């Protein structure tokens, strides 16, 4: 944090990345369409694996 010398003055930061897994077994067209038309809060990444 010191622009010059002062080696012992430091700041520790962290970027915590949270991961949640939702498994949907036995999909239906109705369920999939509902999921499609449902929009999620922004800034939340969603990756869909299929099989």
């Amino acid at each position: 944090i010191s622009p010059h010398v002062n080696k012992d003055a430091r700041d520790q930061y962290e970027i915590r990345t949270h991961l949640r897994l939702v498994d949907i077994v036995e999909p239906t067209e109705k369920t999939v369409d509902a999921l499609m038309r449902l929009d999620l809060a922004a800034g939340v990444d969603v990756q869909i694996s299929l099989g």
Binding site: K30, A34, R37
Partner: protein
Amino acid sequence: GQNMRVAFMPWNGYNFEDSILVSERVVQEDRFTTIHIQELACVSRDTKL
């Protein structure tokens, strides 16, 4: 129907060749009132959405 007391005569033309002149008494007595029962349905389906 009902047995109404009728007279055969022209009356200022309100019974002109097919028309019928009816006293207010017969509508006061509920001579001809009738009940109609209508049926309305509101359906609900498991739509694709």
